[PDB]
Amino acid sequence: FWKKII
Amino acid sequence: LFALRYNILTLMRMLSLKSLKKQMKKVKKMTVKDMVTAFFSSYWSIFM
Numbered sequence A: 001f002w003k004k005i006i
Numbered sequence B: 001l002f003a004l005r006y007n008i009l010t011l012m013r014m015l016s017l018k019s020l021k022k023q024m025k026k027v028k029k030m031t032v033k034d035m036v037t038a039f040f041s042s043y044w045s046i047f048m
Helices: B002-017 B020-026 B032-047
Strands: none
Touching: B002 B032
């Protein structure tokens, strides 16, 4: 998820 | 120096109020539109 925002 | 310290501290007063975790909890789900709106709002206020 945070991977996907980044 | 006074203007810069004051204005940047006001920029981080939002992080001090800690109102991004609630928006975080609302947008636990996956929405690129809401993400681009939130990012644009943050830079919008950086311009402000």
